[PDB]
Amino acid sequence: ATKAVCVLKGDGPVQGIINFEQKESNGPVKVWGSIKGLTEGLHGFHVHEFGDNTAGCTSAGPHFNPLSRKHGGPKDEERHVGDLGNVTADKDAVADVSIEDSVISLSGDHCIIGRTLVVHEKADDLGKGGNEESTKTGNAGSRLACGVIGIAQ
Amino acid sequence: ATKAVCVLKGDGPVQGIINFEQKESNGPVKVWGSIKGLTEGLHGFHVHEFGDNTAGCTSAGPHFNPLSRKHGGPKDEERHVGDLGNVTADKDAVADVSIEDSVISLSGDHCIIGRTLVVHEKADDLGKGGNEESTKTGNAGSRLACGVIGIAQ
Numbered sequence: 001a002t003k004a005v006c007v008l009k010g011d012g013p014v015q016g017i018i019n020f021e022q023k024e025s026n027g028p029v030k031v032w033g034s035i036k037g038l039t040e041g042l043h044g045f046h047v048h049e050f051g052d053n054t055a056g057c058t059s060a061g062p063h064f065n066p067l068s069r070k071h072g073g074p075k076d077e078e079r080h081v082g083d084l085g086n087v088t089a090d091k092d093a094v095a096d097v098s099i100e101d102s103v104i105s106l107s108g109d110h111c112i113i114g115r116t117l118v119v120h121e122k123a124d125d126l127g128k129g130g131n132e133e134s135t136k137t138g139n140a141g142s143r144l145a146c147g148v149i150g151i152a153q
Numbered sequence: 154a155t156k157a158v159c160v161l162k163g164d165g166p167v168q169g170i171i172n173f174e175q176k177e178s179n180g181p182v183k184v185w186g187s188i189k190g191l192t193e194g195l196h197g198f199h200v201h202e203f204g205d206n207t208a209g210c211t212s213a214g215p216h217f218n219p220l221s222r223k224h225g226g227p228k229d230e231e232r233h234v235g236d237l238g239n240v241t242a243d244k245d246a247v248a249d250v251s252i253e254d255s256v257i258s259l260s261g262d263h264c265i266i267g268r269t270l271v272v273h274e275k276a277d278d279l280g281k282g283g284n285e286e287s288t289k290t291g292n293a294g295s296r297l298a299c300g301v302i303g304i305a306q
């Protein structure tokens with residue numbers, strides 16, 4: 001079993017804690033936790049390439065995309081490794097995160113440890129938005145909070 | 154070449170940016186940067202085992218020690234992989250960091266990506282101190298600032 005963790009922080013109200021667990025090296029990764037301070041509705045949720053927070057979340061670069069694919073949602077074949085869809089917040093301003101993914105990993109070439117998890121301003125259109133930007137970022141807006149994904153006990 | 158980066162944050166502000174570069178995986182890692190907000194003198198400087206900052210720097214656990222060795226200085230054979238010695242601050246509250254190390258790595262089972270870099274309250278005695286604790290922590294005191302080590306562009 002391997003485990004990872006990420007503390008999400010930014011310049012405004014948004015903060016969270018996200019845990020990762022992978023029972024077997026070729027198996028799915030369970031992703032769970034909570035984020036507070038979010039507006040009601042969908043917020044894009046991605047692994048970005050660099051675990052670099054030098055100048056804030058912008059330093060993390062583009063979506064983690066080792067296979068040079070176009071942007072999509074987690075249930076699509078055509079997706080970046082980092083494409084984890086959206087988390088959804090209620091009027092309480094909290095998103096409960098509960099995700100299983102078979103494309104990210106905590107080892108090998110799809111490994112996300114040392115990279116940056118980011119929660120966005122707006123919805124990810126999952127590459128179905130019909131514009132050029134949909135196929136790169138999913139039009140999810142500014143980066144509200146982020147952290148580096150680290151090895152957990 | 155592999156590159157990594159770490160943003161150190163803690164109360165003070167104790168704040169720094171530390172860069173890592175390793176030209177080849179069988180080679181040394183160059184470590185450089187700046188830390189501000191430190192009291193004059195030596196401050197212990199270590200890679201700790203977990204990249205977990207859920208409850209602050211205490212969540213990072215003990216020194217990274219994959220080989221089950223005792224604590225030492227960077228030039229000692231008998232050391233933890235995470236043992237990077239001390240950074241020194243002058244009256245202007247800044248430590249200039251400039252370290253080359255052959256034991257840490259940015260890949261393999263001595264890899265430090267996804268773990269936590271910590272700068273401490275007091276001097277590391279490099280395992281040469283009077284006691285039990287010298288062989289475990291180097292007596293370097295509380296954790297002033299830390300961050301998770303991430304992959305850089």
Ligand SMILES: CN1CCCN(c2nc(C(F)(F)F)nc3ccccc23)CC1
Pocket residue numbers: 021029030031032033097098099100
């Ligand atoms: C350490 N574990 C075993 C794995 C199952 N866990 C979870 N997994 C999932 C998941 F990821 F969808 F499977 N969601 C959760 C939501 C809330 C609380 C725990 C969740 C986390 C608890």
Ligand SMILES: CN1CCCN(c2nc(C(F)(F)F)nc3ccccc23)CC1
Pocket residue numbers: 174182183184185186250251252253
């Ligand atoms: C363009 N480079 C190549 C990477 C190595 N660099 C550095 N290395 C080292 C080192 F790590 F000691 F070799 N010290 C530095 C001190 C100040 C500024 C830069 C330093 C940064 C300069």
Ligand SMILES: [Cu+2]
Pocket residue numbers: 044045046047048063118119120
């Ligand atoms: Cu994103």
Ligand SMILES: [Cu+2]
Pocket residue numbers: 197198199200201216271273
């Ligand atoms: Cu330490």
Ligand SMILES: [Zn+2]
Pocket residue numbers: 046063070071072079080082083136137138
């Ligand atoms: Zn994407």
Ligand SMILES: [Zn+2]
Pocket residue numbers: 199216223224225232233235236289290291
């Ligand atoms: Zn040590």
